Structures are given as C-alpha cells and as structure tokens.
C-alpha cells in the first residue's frame, strides 16, 4: 500500500539478523574486506611533535552472508540504504594512531546494501571521511632538503586471518 | 538452517546471563584476572608538567563461570566473538592516571570466548590499545645525564581481594 517497498524489504532481511555476531555462514573461509584510501589534504606535519595530520576518504567493501534477498519479490529492488549501527561492521583500526576516540577521527552515518541473491548475501559499501593523526619518525639529517616517508598500518585488532582478511 | 551456528550458541549462553553482576558461582574464591602489557611507543616525556605519555597494547584474561557450553552441541564450536558491552568486565584502573575519561585512552570493541565445558565457564580474552598519561616524579639532579623511573599502578577501584585478584 502506501508503505514504501523498502520498508518491507528491510523488515524481511532484518528479521533474524543479529548485528553483534560475525555474519558468515560458510565452512571456514574468512570475510574479505577491501579497503580503499583517497588523500584529500595534508593538514599538518608537526616536526617537533613528530606526527602527521591527514584528511582522507575511506571506502570499505565486504559481503554480508545474512542480508541477501531476491529482487523479484520486492519490486526489482536491488539496493537499500541503512544506518551503519544496524548491521555488523569490521573493526578496522589504524595501528599507529595517536587518537583513541573514533568520534574525533571518523564520521559513519549509513551503509549501502546490494543483494547478491536470496542466499548469496549482500555486498556492503561503507563510505566516510577521516582525519588521521599518525606518529611519524622524521629523519632531519638533510633539513631543510629532507624527504620523509609516512607509514599507516591498517588491520583488525580482535579478529585474526581465519575471521577477517 | 540458514541461521549460523554461532547465532544459537549466543542465544544459549546469553539466556539467563546478567552482565551487571559479578559472574562467579564458586564458594568463596575470587576471579583471577591476568594482565599483560606491551610497550609500543613513548609518545612524550613532558618534563615541565612531569607526566609520561605511553602507547601500550593491553591483554586481560579471566574465566567467566556463567558462559560455558558443550562444543558437541554446537558443531564442535569452541570460540565465539562478542561485543565487550554484552558481558561483565572487570574495572581495571590506572591509579596514577591524569585522564579520567576512558574514551580518550582506550578502545574496547570485542571479547573472545573460549568454552571450558558446559558448567566450567569460558575463558575471556580482552585486547585493546591504550594511550596512558601517567604522572611521573622526575629527578633532574643529573640533568642532562639523568635516568628516570616511571611506575604504573593497576588494580580494581571498587572490588577487593575477595572478589577480583
Ligand atoms: C575471500 O578471498 C579468498 C582468497 O584468499 C577466496 O578464496 C578463493 O575461493 C575461490 C572459490 O570461491 C577459489 O577458487 C580460489 O582458489 C580461492 N583463493 C584462494 C587464494 O584461496 C574466497 O573465496 C573469498 N571469499 C570469501 C572468503 O568469502
Ligand atoms: C585463582 O587463583 C588462586 C590462587 O591464589 C587459586 O587457588 C588455588 O586453587 C587450587 C585449586 O583449584 C589449589 O590447588 C591451590 O592450592 C590454590 N592456590 C592458592 C594460592 O590458594 C584459584 O583456584 C584460582 N581460580 C579461581 C579463584 O577461580
Ligand atoms: C523488475 O521487477 C518488476 C517488479 O516485478 C517487474 O515489473 C519488471 O518486469 C522487472 N524487470 C526486469 C528487467 O527484471
Ligand atoms: C566435532 O564436532 C562435529 C559436530 O558434531 C563432529 O561431526 C566431529 O566428529 C567432531 N570432531 C571432533 C574431533 O570432536
């Protein structure tokens, strides 16, 4: 009726979902997470304090094996937009971060769900801006003609290879 | 069916669980918490302010006597990953901390549960990065040839020996 089609689609896939548990049903393979980084601005290079302040655009993609649906049943609907707090999210971490509060470094609002089939799961896309404060060891031997290299390490803090890759 | 085995495992052990109460059933012995510390970086040594800024990796391990299960009933499942806010956590404190807000010094996301038997409980593993700001009394008698010793005290603020060891 007047209820949008996306309303019953969300009710259908969120019925038995439990966002506190890892959403994988297959035998023993992990959940593959793909990370993409875009650099937008180098805000600051603090030499006396030796940290780098970066503005980047982050994109994460993975397959949620519990959120698939058949488009033919929902008006040929293939995508749906949902809040990031309603589903399971990987705990991607910056190992050498100088900021512990993720509220001051990230802005997560919504996720995009694209069905792969009723039992195939749905591909999840996560987009968000970030401001990373990373520790950098600066070699000022050739100052002021020096070249610096900054390394950012990303990974999961609690999940090993058998769970998240 | 299509529901992952870990879904009904969580429903089984979280049925009567109450995370607001200490999870011990034995006669009078306390809960033994083992703490492990790894130093990753000395961020700063503020001499005029006399505090030390440390980047450490913390591991906490204890047995939850209410969260045991029999693996034979759940597809030989022995581990499970859960959110840290779903179970009881010890109130480990840094006595000489200069920062009261734990959001700015810690990053707790998930815990690992390993069954010890149906009525034996489960071993809980807690991993998280920290940035400790500890007050240090600096003795600059031999400056700039001085050696400094920094002490960090850890314990529970509200639980005594008979509860948490
Ligand atoms: C995640 O990535 C792994 C690669 O490490 C994928 O494993 C492949 O699986 C296909 C079958 O779907 C095989 O044909 C390939 O030979 C495998 N590659 C390797 C290197 O093992 C896995 O399928 C991906 N998807 C998951 C785990 O859900
Ligand atoms: C926590 O640690 C205490 C040690 O302080 C453990 O007490 C031991 O218990 C075993 C039996 O399981 C005895 O054989 C040992 O002699 C005890 N040692 C001491 C020093 O009393 C206790 O079992 C551990 N586990 C708890 C309390 O759950
Ligand atoms: C898409 O689904 C709608 C709803 O049933 C249907 O009317 C339409 O023919 C479908 N189109 C394609 C290309 O599948
Ligand atoms: C592990 O549990 C599964 C589930 O019943 C069973 O099929 C398998 O034989 C068990 N293996 C061992 C080594 O216990």
Swiss-Prot record, chains A, B:
Source domain of life: Eukaryota
Effect after changing residue 91 to N: In cb101; highly resistant to monepantel
Tissue: Expressed in the body wall muscles that are arranged into four longitudinal bundles, some mechanosensory neurons, the head muscles and multiple interneurons. Not expressed in motor neurons (at protein level).
Effect of gene knockout: Mutant worms are morphologically similar to the wild-type but exhibit mild swimming defects and are lethargic with their movement being interrupted by frequent pauses when crawling on a food-free environment. On the same environment, in other occasions they display decreased rates of spontaneous reversal and steering, and slightly increased average speed. Homozygotes are fully resistant to monepantel but heterozygotes are partially affected by the drug with reduced fertility and slightly impaired movement.
Disulfide bonding pattern of the chain: 136-150
Glycosylated residue positions: 32, 76
Extracellular side, ranges: 1-165
Location of the protein in the cell: Cell membrane
Purpose: Betaine receptor that functions as a ligand-gated non-selective monovalent cation channel in mechanosensory neurons to maintain basal levels of locomotion. The channel is permeable to Na(+) and K(+) but not to Ba(2+) or Ca(2+) ions. Elicits current in response to betaine, very weak current in response to choline, virtually no current in response to acetylcholine and nicotine, and no current in response to glycine and GABA.
Family: Belongs to the ligand-gated ion channel (TC 1.A.9) family. Acetylcholine receptor (TC 1.A.9.1) subfamily.
Miscellaneous remark of the record: Suppresses snf-3 mutant phenotype growth defects. Elicits no current in response to the broad-spectrum antiparasitic medicine ivermectin. This channel is allosterically sensitive to monepantel, an anthelmintic of the amino-acetonitrile derivatives (AADs) class, leading to muscle paralysis upon treatment with monepantel.
The protein, known as: Betaine receptor acr-23
Organism: Caenorhabditis elegans
Recorded name of the encoding gene: acr-23
